[PDB]
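P.,

For your records, the input lines for the assembly:
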Amino acid sequence: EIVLTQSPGTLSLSPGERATLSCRASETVSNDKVAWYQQKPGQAPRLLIYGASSRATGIPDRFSGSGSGTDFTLSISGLEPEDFVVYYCQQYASSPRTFGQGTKVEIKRTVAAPSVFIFPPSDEQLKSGTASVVCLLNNFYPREAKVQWKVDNALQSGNSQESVTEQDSKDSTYSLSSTLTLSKADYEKHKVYACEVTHQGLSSPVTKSFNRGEC
Amino acid sequence: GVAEMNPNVNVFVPPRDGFSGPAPRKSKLICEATNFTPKPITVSWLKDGKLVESGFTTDPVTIETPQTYKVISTLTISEIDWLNLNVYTCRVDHRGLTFLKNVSSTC
Amino acid sequence: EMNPNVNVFVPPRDGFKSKLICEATNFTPKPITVSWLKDGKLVESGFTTDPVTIEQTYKVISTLTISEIDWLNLNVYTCRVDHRGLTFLKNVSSTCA
Amino acid sequence: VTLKESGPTLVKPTQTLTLTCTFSGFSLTTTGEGVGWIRQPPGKALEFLAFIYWNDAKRYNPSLQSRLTITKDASKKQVVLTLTNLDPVDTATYYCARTSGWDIEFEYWGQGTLVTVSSGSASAPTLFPLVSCENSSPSSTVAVGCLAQDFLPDSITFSWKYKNNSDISSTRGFPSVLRGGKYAATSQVLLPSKDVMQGTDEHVVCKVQHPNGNKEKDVPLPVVI
Ligand SMILES: *[C@@H]1O[C@H](CO)[C@@H](O[C@@H]2O[C@H](CO)[C@@H](O)[C@H](O)[C@H]2NC(C)=O)[C@H](O)[C@H]1NC(C)=O
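Structure tokens returned:
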């Protein structure tokens, strides 16, 4: 059992610069049989380098591998927009083999203030016995952001899944949606529902709320 | 993205001594709508059944709890036309509803 | 430096409370003060001044709240305009009253 | 060299799952060549299930030992995978690859197939209107969305049209999340404020193309101007 941990989880790079990916192994690998893989969301993963030193057919020469033992580093010269995908390091000397956590690289951009909107549940949806309150964040950077739900001054926990979109191809920004789920009877026992959004580019937190019956 | 109210039509006319300048003297007419919602509104001037297509300027709608707006329009008129007992009518179109107000110099 | 024109509008002869509009146009510079008078007495409340707009010339409009009964009682209303140290007074009254 | 996967798109928990990896263009006769299965749950990394070498040599993962079986049929040139004791947390997309030697591992990858493991049934999606309650802050623009709920499997495409059947470029698609045995997703659209204060059209239609029904609910705009 060889545990592979990759750090950092997310890194922000710029086109044309150099990116270094680190792969940590829990023990030495015989014959340095470590390979790297490239995977794009939607499509299928593709092999780039096998044995950490030999490239495969149809792979550009800008990808270079180095290191041995328990430390391996992947260096890429001439970063391209299409290369901002997730990369995994894997060793095939274990039998059975194991895969690492993987690292995601994003395009570096400036900080943009997000937009917060809250939609109260519709009357038709209330008839089904389930109420869904959404909290939308759009055009923010970096991806790291805290979304907290506060209703009647009581902080909620253990009831938010949280969905986040991928990086925009033309805007390079991120968006996420937070959904509040509660019982219909519990909904009638609360008046004000608000989600708090905290951002690095905002001096003070912005809070949005609504009054039951006015929407 | 609370209430809807029908627009109110008010017409302002110059007094008997409100005409000045070289002969022929000219004055202005003011038609204003207040406490109306939604914002869009159409302002037109009618003179003895004839639409006025020149000599008028309408100020942009500005904000004066239901939201309220106000609109100010100015039409240039001649003293001779006023003395001929001509009737000036302000045409207001709002959400498909038409409101007309008739004013005259007769007591 | 051009003296501002003083014009006061009156309610229609055949009926409409109402409002009084005093307009000063073709004046320079932009700052200007407009007040209202009632039978030669200073008005302390019931009047508002709209922000000055650009028609270089400027336009300023003032609104005075009046009652229907007092207007036709031959009350004297005067619009006072102060500009470049000059004061202009215009007296108006109802034609039919 | 190419690979193709196939199997059921919906399987109930605590049952038997069977997948077939269809490959053509090579034979599993030379040494070093082998076939392996790699799965990846959404939002997670790749997971190694098992690998089979030549001469009927198979390897299994100790974490999943005594739970998977590997069988090969040279006549049909396709490996058969059997999965027992299905669990909702094990839902992932399964891929198979060919190793062209001892050092070149997983040189060619196929396309994969989504195998959803949910106790529920493939019911028609349910749409719910969304009315914005924002006030005292019109800002640059406003947003309006459409709540597609109770759909399975997750395959939905969103298109926004006006009352006069116009075209809108939203491109705002949120991924689905498993909540209470069902996938939930939200879709929004950004529209300029000026266009809202214009045409008398007070509503727009939300359209979803799911292979369980062609319902389309409309969201009435509140209009601000
Ligand atoms: C459907 O109605 C909308 C009204 O909301 C039309 O949108 C207007 O027309 C122009 C020209 O197409 C658009 O670019 C603008 O968004 C709208 N105009 C203004 C002034 O806001 C839309 O064009 C109509 N569809 C068709 C096919 O005519």
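Two observations worth noting. Residues D 162, 164, 166, 194-195, 198-199, 201 surround ligand 1 (CB under 6 Å). The longest strand of chain C covers residues 18-27.

Regards
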